[model samples]
Target: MEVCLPNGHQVVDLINNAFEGRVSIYSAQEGWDKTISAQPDMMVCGGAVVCMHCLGVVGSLQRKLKHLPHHRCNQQIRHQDYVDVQFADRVTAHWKRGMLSFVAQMHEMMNDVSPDDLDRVRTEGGSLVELNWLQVDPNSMFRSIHSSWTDPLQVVDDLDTKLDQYWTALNLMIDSSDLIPNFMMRDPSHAFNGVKLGGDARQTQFSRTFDSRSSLEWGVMVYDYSELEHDPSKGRAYRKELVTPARDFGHFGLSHYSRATTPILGKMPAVFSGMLTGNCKMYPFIKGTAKLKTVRKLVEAVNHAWGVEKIRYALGPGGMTGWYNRTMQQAPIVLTPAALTMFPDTIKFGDLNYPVMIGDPMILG
Candidate 1:
């Protein structure tokens, strides 16, 4: 079977397309430059490390939560229809859903477990007391052991009902740890560009260094029977043997570079792609930067200003130029420090109410 992408699209491409035709890139050369500026929404960090693990963590979270708004409008009535009704409202709703799911899942996976049980599951392997392991997989692994096992289907269904009762109460206990009121994103009016950077940026991020350091080792869980199983037909009725591999109950991290899947410990991100899979390999922009501390500080400042929880940089294919010989990479972005400073502080044209300079121009100058 061919792996089919329903939309046959990339998230970046789709979003970028929405910005195109309707919203054009600001350019100074020809006649495109308006030269109007508003308060800066994004900041640049000189000599930044661009933490590798941060991307891994955020990207992992993004996959779970990020969504683009799809609104099917039959007819456009007024300017309000285009601006207020369609675009802005859709973006707001999308983030609300994403943040809600993110918080709910984190609470369920992390907060609900008892400290003793959490550690036991983290170090040794075991099932969560509150969960029905049968629900996770009912037919194969569960049935193999539960062969007594008459009315196996009904038993699984009944076990599901038992766990459903306490599910919400269990997760709600940990809700207070992460402040829900604080989880909402800052006002969209704060963004310099009319384009909202989705909803709940700064609030939904999880970038605590302690989480990475204190978390368990990095590896995927393999099936192992925490409780052993024995086959009666093999003549070992009273005996117990390990089956259904053991899976640890705990794992968490922020600056950990590892698999793009659940149940991972720690690893450094060396390479990545804008898309899920690709040939363009990008690394953290840390090579020529100052020490890790300085870079991290710069990153933190930028992150705070942008109101985004995490930040990482990837320069994507040949966008560099060189000295002496006047050699340039496959893609050339030419700009001088002095030329950059010439951009006006406040540039506006048409109905476009946004900033000309995205980040601090002084950093380049």
Candidate 2:
């Protein structure tokens, strides 16, 4: 299926819908005229000079819709592949204010659902209905119980090795004059520079960013009826009880810190940073860790399943730096066996194999 990006008018409609029509495009234009300066950097698209105010709205929309173009001036403008930087920055502040209001409303709506209502929906296949803004379809979703056993010491050793690799990559980027731009190197004492791998300072930096672990408590998992099973080793019959629910095998819970919470989130920024700076070498090794590569497929799968091209995981402060530092220990959004059955086994990216998801055009529609 062809990927279709939204046009200017559709983008405007989306922004209005996201804000519940409280701030209509016309109203936004009028407000921009009063507050914004006279010297606006108009975005030239298809020989048409689109106002920065409207571009700002596009910027806010692009945060949730990754397929949208970044704000910059380039030949790609003819293809509607850019957002005006200044207005985008301005509108981002405005968008955050709007998001806060929506989040507050969501909390209230969640609180309104009674235990009985939740139980009914859980068994009967429905949602709170008021949370339609979340754009999840409960009927098609599933819940599953997964349990894994890992040695604590082994886990610690694995974590340390991964952390060392992470810092090693960071230091490589910093030292490589061809990788990082000279301007970004202005702060010689910047945290990104000179971090010794597996050292105390590195560990301290890791702790600052990797603070807090939250438990995953969503979805239903129950004990199944015990049954007699033949045990060849014991030469006798033994009872075995399944630890999973009999019906509805899938569960998905996304943390509020979805945007910019993991290494995968850094891929685009690192790639684009390299691209813009005329450094192509950064692409192959950009955040090159096996863990990061493994998670990419899962992330792509969820975005496709959710009918979105991509969703930002790091919407926290300080961009990539903030994302790295404020990354939380939370469960990844999961798609169980049923969901996987609906997804393609692989989406080939030239030689690389990636997870593929079914796309619903109605997300942009």
Candidate 3:
């Protein structure tokens, strides 16, 4: 009656484990895919390359479900989505100067189209379910970190020195958005310390790198995670924390900030940021369009008007998501207008939550 007789209790525990794992598995796939597809978009989205593949995967899924089934497809696109096109052109517009707004805010539609009716799904089982609910995009989550990453050293002099100008520019955006209160920027995620890549690379640490650094390439030695946890640009886990030294940007080992401290942008629907700079420092393939040059004015104006707290304030499950979630929640939202004055569409921003990061994915991809 003591051990073996606890059948009911055992059954509940087993079911709970299965249920939790199920949620994670389904949510993981869409997130991975979105990060991959949105890699390019993420570049424009801006942030640390915490997991561009993951971000691209999630963004792809968002765009995919954005059609008739997803309520976000309404006539008014959200602010975040609006800035996406603007950021994209900033990076890819190549030789052309970007306009204040975009001319075309087009979205890729699902092949399975119905009679343009939103009510069709209610009558039939053809409704599209959120295949995965926990997927995330770390792009915006690490935007401040990414904005701090460029190193044309000979011309810039030092890391903090180079960052000074961008930080000033970033403040302009923050001031305009009025989102300075909800969150604060700190050291880079644990991933940048420059150990070796995790998993298989853990054993093969001899071959990896940190921050794309070279063993032969020498630079100022960075030290202390707690002291320098403010920006992803300065921490030197790769050179200092490693048992052995490697190049500056090579893979030694990597770490990410716990979700409790820093939330991922892609995963959270509404979130905070620094500025768009280089398709999120590490993973460039995802969304290289969200660079800061595109959204500077809007961000500055926002910071100038509201405080950072308002931009990243917590939101209630309103008409946009009340049915899905009834409880009120909080998140950071920093809005900035992208460089598209001629675009045919406007954008909207939503409340972001849930930074879903299953064991980190392989960094090579």
Candidate 4:
């Protein structure tokens, strides 16, 4: 069994909004209350509260539709070549998928039953259809007991078939959602990094097996479930047992965070190790940020903006001072409005991104 990282456990950064210091020192509340107090930063930043239960609800209400991409861990891709590819394109895909499934589930649930029947399942803990003496499973029983009572086998086929159709239809819908025509990403003119992905020499990503294929090949093989070598021992599957009356489906965290083997939710970011000391790059400044690795412009950019001084210390992941401080120090110096009053730019950098920043930089400053 893998041992947990020594400091991997979350060190709750209790924001003492009143400048009293972390409430753990003066408050009597348990973890929940304290946790609630500490969460304003993340919540305000719009980290949706899809905890494990919420994740499960997010999944089930969508009818077994897996939208949130779980990180596929315990996976192996050998040398036959490289290490695991951490980020894959899945977040946006899942959001798109979930929205599709959300509507589909709504259609399935309502097409057959009335709002009252859904409420019956929600509030009464029983189905509208007769199931004799057995207790009702508020979650799964909807499969059979909804008003669309065709023969059991017939209904089963219809539901599954329709679900498949929904998924197929979703691909077309996604394409339609993209108003622009053809505009592929890999071509020499593929408009990226203030440039296009075009004129690409073949790029092969490393995956589960040695010498993984090019991006095109990976895309071709992606959705074939029968071809998927999903291992049960490594732990991957749906977990849906939680229920809230207003939440007809989709368990909150059951979608991704709970599992290691789920898909990535968004585009995979790129990085470079050979970069020079003078040029620490912002996420977007690296031209698609994850793409081009040559330090030619990166060094120049850093030298031009942050000066060559800060770049020497900025390296390895989120190497910026603030992030590094958050990770390494336990009782690091806390910057408050009073402390930040010394530096006008303190409020500036912290508020650069929307839904990504806390407006009142005082607490975070």
lDDT of every predicted structure (CA atoms): 0.21, 0.22, 0.21, 0.20
Q: What are the per-residue Cα lDDT tens digits for candidate 4 across 33-76?
A: 22221111011001121111111111122233223324322222
Off by over 4 Å in 2: 1-83, 131-365
Residue-level lDDT tens digits of model 2 in 204-224: 221111101222111211111
C-alpha lDDT of candidate 2 relative to the true structure: 0.22
Worst 10 residues of 4 by lDDT: 356-365
For candidate 2, the clash count comes to: 13
Model 2 lDDT-worst window of ten: 254-263
Q: Is candidate 1 or candidate 2 better by TM-score?
A: 2
TM-score of each: 0.19, 0.20, 0.16, 0.19
**Candidate 3 least-lDDT 10 residues:** 98-107
Question: In angstroms, how far off is 24's CA in candidate 3?
Answer: 25
Which candidate number has the best lDDT? 2
- Ten-residue segment with the worst summed lDDT in candidate 1? 356-365
lDDT-best of 1 and 4: 1
Better of 1 and 4 by TM-score: 1
lDDT of 3 by residue, 45-106 (tens): 21111111121112222243322122221122223432423233222211011000100000
* Runs of candidate 4 exceeding 4 Å displacement: 1-92, 99-104, 115-125, 128-323, 327-365
Q: What is candidate 3's CA lDDT for residue 195?
A: 23
Model 4 TM-score (2 dp): 0.19
Give the per-residue lDDT of model 1 (tens digit) for 151-267.
111212222122222222322232222111111111111222232222222121212111212321222111121122222332211111111100010111111111111111111
